[PDB]
From Swiss-Prot, chain A:
Naturally occurring in which organism (per UniProt): Homo sapiens
Glycyl lysine isopeptide (Lys-Gly) (interchain with G-Cter in SUMO2) cross-link, renumbered residues: 54
Function (record text): Binds specifically to cytosolic chaperonin (c-CPN) and transfers target proteins to it. Binds to nascent polypeptide chain and promotes folding in an environment in which there are many competing pathways for nonnative proteins.
Signal peptide from the UniProt entry: none
N6-acetyllysine: residues carrying this PTM: 9, 54
Highest taxon of the lineage: Eukaryota
Residue numbers of the full-length protein present here: 13 to 114 of 129
Statement: the UniProt record of this protein carries the keyword Magnesium: no
Protein name in UniProt: Prefoldin subunit 6
Placement of covalent cross-link Glycyl lysine isopeptide (Lys-Gly) (interchain with G-Cter in SUMO1): 54
Annotated keywords: Acetylation, Chaperone, Isopeptide bond, Ubl conjugation
Subunit structure: Heterohexamer of two PFD-alpha type and four PFD-beta type subunits. Component of the PAQosome complex which is responsible for the biogenesis of several protein complexes and which consists of R2TP complex members RUVBL1, RUVBL2, RPAP3 and PIH1D1, URI complex members PFDN2, PFDN6, PDRG1, UXT and URI1 as well as ASDURF, POLR2E and DNAAF10/WDR92.
Similarity field: Belongs to the prefoldin subunit beta family.
GO molecular function: amyloid-beta binding; protein-folding chaperone binding; unfolded protein binding
Swiss-Prot record, chain B:
Enzyme class label: hydrolase
Protein name: T-complex protein 1 subunit beta
Assembly and binders: Component of the chaperonin-containing T-complex (TRiC), a hexadecamer composed of two identical back-to-back stacked rings enclosing a protein folding chamber. Each ring is made up of eight different subunits: TCP1/CCT1, CCT2, CCT3, CCT4, CCT5, CCT6A/CCT6, CCT7, CCT8. Interacts with PACRG. Interacts with FLCN. Interacts with DLEC1. Interacts with SVEP1.
Originating organism: Homo sapiens (Human)
Chief subcellular location: cytoplasm
Binding site for Mg(2+): 82
Cross-link Glycyl lysine isopeptide (Lys-Gly) (interchain with G-Cter in SUMO2): where in chain: 233
Catalytic reaction(s) noted: ATP + H2O = ADP + phosphate + H(+)
Amino acids binding ATP: 29, 83-85, 480, 485
Residues binding ADP, per UniProt: 29, 83-86, 153-154, 395, 480, 485
Gene Ontology molecular functions: ATP binding; ATP hydrolysis activity; ATP-dependent protein folding chaperone; protein folding chaperone; ubiquitin protein ligase binding; unfolded protein binding
Pfam families, per the entry: Cpn60_TCP1
Post-translational modification Phosphoserine, affected residues: 45, 245
From Swiss-Prot, chain C:
Top-level class of the enzyme under EC nomenclature: hydrolase
Species classification: Eukaryota, Metazoa, Chordata, Craniata, Vertebrata
Catalytic reactions of this protein: ATP + H2O = ADP + phosphate + H(+)
Positions bound to ADP: 28, 80-83, 147-149, 400, 485
Stated family: Belongs to the TCP-1 chaperonin family.
N6-acetyllysine modified-residue sites: 263, 277, 294, 301
A GO term for molecular function: ATP binding
Protein name: T-complex protein 1 subunit delta
Swiss-Prot record, chain D:
Residues annotated to bind Mg(2+): 21
Highest taxon above the source species: Eukaryota
Subunit structure of this chain's protein: Component of the chaperonin-containing T-complex (TRiC), a hexadecamer composed of two identical back-to-back stacked rings enclosing a protein folding chamber. Each ring is made up of eight different subunits: TCP1/CCT1, CCT2, CCT3, CCT4, CCT5, CCT6A/CCT6, CCT7, CCT8. Interacts with PACRG. Interacts with GBA1. Interacts with DLEC1.
Annotated protein name in UniProt: T-complex protein 1 subunit alpha
Organism (species): Homo sapiens
Similarity annotation: Belongs to the TCP-1 chaperonin family.
Location in the cell: Cytoplasm, Cytosol; Cytoplasm, Cytoskeleton, Microtubule organizing center, Centrosome
Residues engaged in binding ATP: 22-24
Disorder this protein is connected to according to its UniProt record: Intellectual developmental disorder with polymicrogyria and seizures: An autosomal dominant neurologic disorder characterized by a broad phenotypic spectrum. Main clinical features are developmental delay of varying severity, intellectual disability, seizures, and polymicrogyria. Additional variable features are non-specific pyramidal or cerebellar signs, and visual impairment.
Disulfide cysteine pairs (residue numbers): none
Gene: TCP1
UniProt: ADP binding residues: 22-25
Length: 102, 509, 508, 67, 517
């Protein structure tokens, strides 16, 4: 029954964005190595928004760290919302399953 | 559910309360010999007390007599303060004496009737033992000095008692009228040494806004405030908690400052020398309070500030419902004074004349927690003594005459009255026992000395367990406030005859 | 009636004394080891009775008084703590006598602490006032003490350190009491007893510098009681997302301000920053802290609130929970704060000299090993204790129990002098004393009963003319080879007997 | 299984770490002087009294080891 | 599945009444030392009569069981003499085994006891006055509430309750034509006032709802409006979310509040009784916005209260605010806003001279103990007059009838003879137990003390005088003014032999293995 689905639905929904963070998180680590590697040897660039800002080395690492951090925090965001959306489905299942049935 | 009938209960109600009225009287008295406190809840966890109120707490006792006598000495703590462990043994000197009569077959009814008017026959002899020392302000201050140490000693304070024996009477000397705890602002504070305790004459804020806001404020305009700067109190100058947008939880914090700005303007709209706010003042309106050049007092006391509202004459903003209308406190000078290890806001020359603020200096909390309680008992006593300024001849010197009196009463009368009353006046005569016995001195002679005194009758001389022997009753401190005594003597006198009604104890247990 | 309390008291008498006894064999350097089993299934060889109180016991309250008793003597002195066990029972020995006599607990009590006064007086002059301004006389006496006492190994080697940081925290020629407060015991794994040193400014645990300043000087020392990371939301910082549009929009907010809150700190004039533990914190994001280390503040993070309070009380860096709450009072000034890696394992931060309330000295005890570090820890300890005992009590009292053996003998006839029902009390009171070095005498062997008969008369004669001296552990001039102690350690070990007894005397 | 037995095997091993000589031995006079001094303390002796002497006695041998 | 034999069981039964009647025997009257209770749940308390204690005490045994059973009807109607039959029926109980011990039928003994009550009944019938009237019975109820308000909470009769006792029972009595119901009269304590705050309440008393006092405190009409409907927008004493989805709905609410206030101010007023008891709870905000409008608005009302005060009025309730009629409003003889105590809120006292189908007289207390100690006085003092108006008959009690009613019966014995004389003899003696037992619980030698009015009983007959119940040096029931409803004594008489008559009932003392199980 539809009530059971949204909770399953929003589950993998907010699950989707939470995962790709880790690959970003992974490359956030990949760039830290290079932001530890670059002294600014060749022009360092953040790009956030349709503008490409002038970026400086020293502000970039704390950024990507925050970016790493900010993303790293975002494993917890839905892992809260995971069980949230996971639970409300299960609760209605036996009901709505049997409701589907009879 | 289960009948507990007369005699076997009357043993149990006695024998426990008999046991109860002992380790308290053991401890009771200046030479009253201590009892180790035992917390079976935490290991053995121990103190060693002269206080029976502690005794009840640590080791829980079940006697209906006790549970009554618990409440009695407790209400003798709740009312009389000092006299708790004394009213305890007070009925204890009865029940043992009653054991005889009870074992003698003698109806509690008899004793109920008999010790009753016996209880009275001394009462006015006790009121005769009531002797005014109010006769001068100094003589009552001498009387303030009389029973002050009398209370605090058996409450277990001595070294730092003297300072409090000193300090408390003058704050209470400001009363000269009803003893007023409104007027008396209690501050007991950690910090300072045993000599650093202090009496502010006025109201005092032991908190300090110090450097951030005004410190010294003359001719104070004192605004007693419940005014939330962060609280969103009535006359909300921005978006409250309400639904407008789904993100409104954030939108509430935005209008907060545009609320904090206007509210300081409102708090400035009074105009004040100081702003006493029982709730939060945030750092931003702080300098806005500073933009009003006003001492910003936040999280202010819920009681002192009320006394401040009472003693300095302020009126609380009451959730800031009066942007002008609210009345304001005025003291001649607001002085932040370093006392002990901290600075304290002192309001000098507050509206109320009786008003003070005592400032106690605990070197630790162990010093800070114990004394101010013991400090309190005399004051309530003294407060009664302020109203009715009286002593009774101590060291049993009141006791023997009353014993004598009721005994002189006894001889002629003895229906079931003096039969009891004879057994009664003994309890009047049974206190000097333990006091010399806690002191470790043969009471019989000394008693019979003090007997042969009040047999002869006598006032100026009674048993002194200090020296250990009979001595002058000059109101030396050796003759002690009637206020306690009657109260005490009013109290356990009933509990016996009261509980004498219940040999009829029944138990759902 | 009061039987049970008397019984209790009798039991209390029996109980605590039954505890007070076995160490009287362990009493002194001549005393013996004790192998302590517990429910731990472990046999533990112990001469020190203070731990024997601590390490092993039952919960008996008068036995609790004992584990209470010397524990105070630890902080009271750190000396005669075993011996304040030895003092108490002796009186309690004399007690049941007076209770077999039936003397009254108030009467029993008031006779005694009084008599202790009466005792300490004659006792006091036995002691010799020695110069507390002269660090050498301080050295000598304490060192003589130290060499009249248990630990000379590192203590005497550490005595130039001990008395100095003391002499540092000694302002007066009186040398006051000299509390150990500003004095900071520190250690370093390994190192050396020579790598031990006093330090004039606070040696601190490790350091945080990402871009952070290593050496900063005249350094205003910041406290942080506030989170620099912005509040922790789903990890350390502010995130709300079910989707990346959500995260990418609000990510603007968290990043910028934590930099600002970082900024203002250096704007508040922090050359050093004390950050207590990230649990004592919300947390510090090391990248904004790298942004903060970029502020070239000297960041010491994850540090104890105690050390915060120590650095608060001692060198005067007071708690800062807010940017506004940064203030020079709450910012200590480190004339040099620079970490040092050397003389032993790894690095501890060195504030080299510092602005301090009073004067804050610290000592870093390093060793051949950790035990050798502890061999210093023990060593400075009582080396500082005898100081606190000698500086607080100038008068230098001899060891060996002779001070009793003189005074007990004295107070007896002075108790006799009292007459009254009580004259018997102070005798047995005094009489209690000389049995203490008796065991100690027997702890050295021979026959105290023979000796203490005589040393008494010796201490009826020249009063110090002979006495107990550990070299013999028997009849000797306590002054010849000096067995000496500050007047304090004695009077330390004194009243706790004349109190807890007088306490336990009137106990029901 | 005894604190003595505990205090000993280390010492024989202490001897045995050093040299195979005295190892099975030293436990001997470890036992000897005990039983010897056992009654001495029981006699009038205080365990401290002569125990220094046995060291002073321990030196005579090494005083003799010289010669 | 073990079975006691007859006398055995009764010997096992006789083991019961002894101690439980004993508890009364030193508790009888004020000279009786009253009864104490303690709990497995840890509550020590004082208890009284049989019922209080014997209900608070728990009863193991069929004998003990029937006690509370036998007890109820007593204290229900008369309220005074409850503890009595306990001793009495227990005494006769111990007279029964006795005559079985004397080898006389359990059958027969219970036989001649019954009409032995009659020769005590006819004896009691004569005693004192079988009459009282309004101005008269004022004074004995004065006396009754003398000994009632002087024996229990305070030993000082406080004439207020002493008169509060007389008036409202009359109020239900004079309504019911010299009939009255203890249900209708009701004794209501609320502490925070005093035992000297004592109120004669012929109507209902409830705290007047103020979500604001300053928004005018008032009582209006004399009449009450009892409402299941709103007098202001309604709510069932349960949380009602006040939020507004926009900043604008913030504006319309308080208007809606006041639009229905004035409308319910309108439509309940036009119904009647601007004071309106709305069964519904409601926000303290808008409740005082109607208060701000007008008419203190009673909200958060007990669901019982509305129908309670409804039936008392005899009027109905408005179930639905669209339904409006004054009969669905209540009836207050007087609605009166009354400050409850000096300590706390005004109440709204609805005193119903319109119809009171319940009358709950009121008192306060400095303590909940004493206030119930006082109600303990009040109930049973209202219980005597209850019957005592239904029959105004009173008999000087306290052993004077006991020493006397035994006269007829024990003298009726050899008038009777065969088994009845015994059942006259071992009957009547149980009467003089109590003056003995009252002298017992006193400091008095009972047989001695009993011997006294005995001589009187030979000297005089059926003394309106008697022995001191108050333990007064003088012995009357006149000087003592100890006189009980000549119902209640006989009402009490009815109880005692009945129990013995109960313990005999059938031949079955057997148990399946279930007896008390």
């Amino acid at each position: 029954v539809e009530k059971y689905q949204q909770l399953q639905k929003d589950l993998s929904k907010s699950m989707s964005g939470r995962q790709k963070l880790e690959a970003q998180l992974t490359e956030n680590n990949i760039v830290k190595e290079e932001l530890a590697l670059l002294d600014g040897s060749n022009v360092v660039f953040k790009l956030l928004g349709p503008v490409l800002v002038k970026q400086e080395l020293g502000e970039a690492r704390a950024t990507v760290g925050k970016r790493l951090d900010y993303i790293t925090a975002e494993i917890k965001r839905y892992e809260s919302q995971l069980r949230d959306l996971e639970r409300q489905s299960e609760q209605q299942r036996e009901t709505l399953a049997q409701l589907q049935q009879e | 559910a289960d009948e507990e009938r007369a005699e076997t209960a009357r043993l149990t109600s006695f024998i426990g309360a008999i046991a109860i009225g002992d380790l308290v009287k053991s401890t009771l008295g200046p030479k009253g010999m201590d009892k180790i406190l035992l917390s079976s809840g935490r290991d053995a966890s121990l103190m060693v007390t002269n206080d029976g109120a502690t005794i009840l707490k640590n080791i829980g006792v079940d006697n209906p007599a006790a549970k009554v006598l618990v409440d009695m000495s407790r209400v003798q703590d709740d009312e009389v303060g000092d006299g708790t462990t004394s009213v305890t043994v007070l009925a204890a000197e009865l029940l043992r004496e009653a054991e005889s009569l009870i074992a003698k077959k003698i109806h509690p009814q008899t004793i109920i009737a008999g010790w009753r008017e016996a209880t009275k026959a001394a009462r006015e002899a006790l009121l005769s033992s009531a002797v005014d020392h109010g006769s001068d302000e100094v003589k009552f201050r001498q009387d303030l000095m009389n029973i002050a140490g009398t209370t605090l000693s058996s409450k277990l304070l001595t070294h730092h008692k003297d300072h409090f024996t000193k300090l408390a009477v003058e704050a209470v000397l400001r009363l000269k009228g009803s003893g007023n705890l409104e007027a008396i602002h209690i501050i007991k504070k950690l910090g300072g040494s045993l000599a650093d305790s202090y009496l502010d004459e006025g109201f005092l804020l032991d908190k300090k806004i110090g450097v951030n806001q005004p410190k010294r404020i003359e001719n104070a305009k004192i605004l007693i405030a419940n005014t939330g700067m962060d609280t969103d109190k009535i006359k909300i100058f921005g978006s409250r908690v309400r639904v407008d947008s789904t993100a409104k939880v954030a939108e509430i914090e935005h209008a907060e400052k545009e609320k904090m700005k206007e509210k300081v303007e409102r708090i400035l709209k009074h105009g004040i020398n100081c702003f006493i706010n029982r709730q939060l003042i945030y750092n931003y309106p702080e300098q806005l309070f500073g933009a009003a050049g006003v001492m910003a007092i936040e999280h202010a006391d819920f009681a002192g500030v009320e006394r401040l509202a009472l003693v300095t004459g302020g009126e609380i903003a009451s959730t800031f419902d009066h942007p002008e209308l609210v009345k304001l406190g005025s003291c001649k000078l607001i002085e932040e004074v370093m006392i002990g290890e901290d600075k304290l806001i002192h309001f000098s020359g507050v509206a109320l004349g009786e008003a003070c603020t005592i400032v106690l200096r605990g070197a630790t909390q162990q010093i800070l927690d114990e004394a101010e309680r013991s400090l309190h008992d005399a004051l309530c006593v003294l407060a009664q003594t302020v109203k009715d300024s009286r002593t009774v001849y101590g060291g049993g010197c009141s006791e023997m005459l009353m014993a004598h009196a009721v005994t002189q009463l006894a001889n002629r009368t003895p229906g079931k009255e003096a039969v009891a009353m004879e057994s009664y006046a003994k309890a009047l005569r049974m206190l000097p026992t333990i006091i010399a016995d806690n002191a470790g001195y043969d009471s019989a002679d000394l008693v019979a000395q003090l007997r042969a005194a009040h047999s002869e009758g006598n006032t100026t001389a009674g048993l002194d367990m200090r020296e250990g022997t009979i001595g002058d009753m000059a109101i030396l401190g050796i003759t002690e406030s009637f206020q306690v005594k009657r109260q005490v003597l009013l109290s356990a006198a009933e509990a016996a005859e009261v509980i004498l009604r219940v040999d009829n104890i029944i138990k759902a247990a | 009636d009061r039987d049970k309390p008397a019984q209790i008291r009798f039991s209390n008498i029996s109980a605590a004394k039954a505890v007070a006894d076995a160490i009287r064999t362990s009493l002194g350097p001549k005393g013996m080891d004790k192998m302590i089993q517990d429910g731990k299934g472990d046999v533990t060889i112990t001469n020190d009775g203070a731990t024997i109180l601590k390490q092993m016991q039952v919960l008996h309250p008068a036995a609790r008084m004992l584990v209470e008793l010397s524990k105070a003597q630890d902080i009271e002195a750190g000396d005669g703590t075993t011996s304040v066990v030895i003092i108490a029972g002796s009186l309690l020995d004399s007690c049941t006598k007076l209770l077999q006599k039936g003397i009254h607990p108030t009467i029993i009590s008031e006779s005694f602490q009084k008599a202790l006064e009466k005792g300490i007086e004659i006792l006091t002059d036995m002691s010799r006032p020695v110069e507390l301004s002269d660090r050498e006389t301080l050295l000598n006496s304490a060192t003589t003490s130290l060499n009249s006492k248990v630990v000379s190994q590192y203590s005497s080697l550490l005595s130039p350190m001990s008395v100095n940081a003391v002499m540092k925290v000694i302002d007066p020629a009186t040398a006051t009491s000299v509390d150990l407060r500003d004095i900071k015991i520190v250690k370093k794994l390994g190192g050396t007893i020579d790598d031990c040193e006093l330090v004039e400014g606070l040696v601190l645990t490790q350091k945080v510098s990402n871009s952070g300043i290593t050496r900063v000087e005249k350094a205003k020392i910041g406290l942080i009681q506030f989170c620099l990371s912005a509040p922790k939301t789903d990890m350390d910082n502010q995130i709300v997302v079910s989707d990346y549009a959500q995260m990418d929009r609000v990510l603007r907010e968290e990043r910028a301000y934590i930099l600002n809150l970082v900024k203002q700190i250096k704007k508040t004039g922090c050359n050093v920053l004390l950050i207590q533990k990230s649990i004592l914190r919300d947390a510090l994001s090391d990248l904004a802290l790298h942004f903060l280390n970029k502020m070239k503040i000297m960041v010491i993070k994850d540090i104890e609130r105690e050390d915060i309070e120590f650095i608060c009380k001692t060198i005067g860096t007071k708690p800062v929970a807010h940017i506004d709450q940064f203030t020079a009072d709450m910012l200590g000034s480190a004339e040099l704060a620079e970490e040092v890696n050397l003389n032993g394992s790894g690095k501890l931060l060195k504030i080299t000299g510092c602005a301090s309330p009073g004067k804050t000295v610290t000592i870093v005890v390093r060793g051949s090993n950790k035990l050798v570090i502890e061999e210093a820890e023990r060593s400075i300890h009582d080396a500082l204790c005898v100081i606190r005992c000698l500086v607080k009590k100038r008068a230098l009292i001899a060891g060996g129990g002779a001070p009793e053996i003189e005074l007990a003998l004295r107070l007896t006839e002075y108790s006799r002098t009292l007459s009254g029902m009580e004259s018997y009390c102070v005798r047995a009171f005094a009489d209690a004393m000389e049995v203490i070095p008796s065991t100690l005498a027997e702890n050295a062997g021979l026959n105290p009963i023979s000796t203490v008969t005589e040393l008494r008369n010796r201490h009826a004669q020249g009063e110090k003319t002979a006495g107990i001296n550990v070299r013999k552990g028997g009849i000797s001039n306590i002054l010849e080879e000096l067995v000496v102690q500050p007047l304090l350690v004695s009077v330390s070990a004194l009243t706790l007997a004349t109190e807890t007894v007088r306490s336990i005397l009137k106990i029901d | 299984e005894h604190p003595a037995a505990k205090v000993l095997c280390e010492l024989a091993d202490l001897q045995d770490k050093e040299v195979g000589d005295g190892t099975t031995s030293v436990v001997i006079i470890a036992a000897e002087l005990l039983k010897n001094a056992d009654e001495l303390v029981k006699q009038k002796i205080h365990p401290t009294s002569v125990i220094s002497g046995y060291r002073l006695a321990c030196k005579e041998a090494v005083r003799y080891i010289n010669e | 599945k073990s079975r006691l034999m007859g006398l055995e069981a009764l010997k096992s039964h006789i083991m019961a009444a002894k101690a439980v009647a004993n508890t009364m025997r030193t508790s009888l009257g004020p000279n009786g030392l009253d009864k104490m209770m303690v709990d497995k749940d840890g509550d020590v308390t004082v208890t009284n009569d049989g019922a209080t204690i014997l209900s608070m005490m728990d009863v193991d045994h069929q004998i003990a069981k029937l006690m509370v059973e036998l007890s109820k009807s007593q204290d229900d109607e008369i309220g005074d003499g409850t503890t009595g039959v306990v001793v009495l029926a227990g005494a006769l109980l111990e007279e029964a085994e006795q005559l079985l011990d004397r080898g006389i039928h359990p059958i027969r003994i219970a036989d001649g006891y019954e009409q032995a009550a009659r020769v005590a009944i006819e004896h009691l019938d004569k005693i004192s006055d079988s009459v009282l009237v309004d101005i008269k019975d004022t004074e004995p109820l004065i006396q009754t509430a003398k000994t009632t308000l002087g024996s229990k909470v305070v030993n000082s009769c406080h004439r207020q309750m002493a008169e509060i006792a007389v008036n409202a029972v009359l109020t239900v009595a004079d309504m019911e034509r010299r009939d009255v119901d203890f249900e209708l009269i009701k004794v209501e304590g609320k502490v925070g006032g005093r035992l000297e705050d004592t109120k004669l309440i012929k109507g209902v008393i409830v705290d007047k709802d103020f979500s604001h006092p300053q928004m005018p405190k008032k009582v209006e009409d004399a009449k009450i409006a009892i409402l299941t409907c709103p007098f202001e927008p309604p709510k069932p004493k349960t949380k009602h979310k006040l939020d507004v989805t926009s900043v604008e709905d913030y504006k319309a609410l308080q208007k809606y509040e006041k639009e229905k206030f004035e409308e319910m101010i309108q439509q309940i007023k036009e119904t009647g009784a601007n004071l309106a008891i709305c069964q519904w709870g409601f926000d303290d905000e808008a409740n005082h916005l109607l208060l701000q409008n007008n008419l203190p608005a009673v909200r958060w009302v007990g669901g019982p209260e509305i129908e309670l005060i409804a039936i008392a009025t005899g009027g109905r309730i408005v179930p639905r605010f669209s339904e409006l009629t004054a009969e669905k409003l209540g009836f207050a003889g007087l609605v009166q806003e009354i400050s409850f105590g000096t300590t706390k809120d005004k109440m709204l006292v609805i005193e119903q001279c319109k119809n009171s189908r319940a009358v709950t007289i009121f008192i306060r207390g400095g303590n909940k103990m004493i206030i119930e100690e006082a109600k303990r006085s009040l109930h049973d003092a209202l219980c005597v007059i209850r019957n005592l108006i239904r029959d105004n008959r009173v008999v000087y009690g306290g052993g004077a009838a006991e020493i006397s009613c035994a006269l007829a019966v024990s003298q009726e014995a050899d008038k009777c003879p065969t088994l009845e004389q015994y059942a006259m003899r071992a009957f009547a003696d149980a009467l003089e137990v109590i003056p003995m037992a009252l002298s017992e619980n006193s400091g008095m030698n009972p047989i001695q003390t009993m011997t006294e009015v005995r001589a009187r009983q030979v000297k005089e007959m059926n003394p309106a005088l008697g022995i001191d119940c108050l333990h007064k040096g003088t012995n009357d029931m006149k000087q003592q003014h100890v006189i009980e409803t000549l119902i209640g004594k006989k009402q009490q008489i009815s109880l005692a032999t009945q129990m013995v008559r109960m313990i005999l009932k059938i031949d079955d003392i057997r148990k399946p293995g279930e007896s008390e199980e």
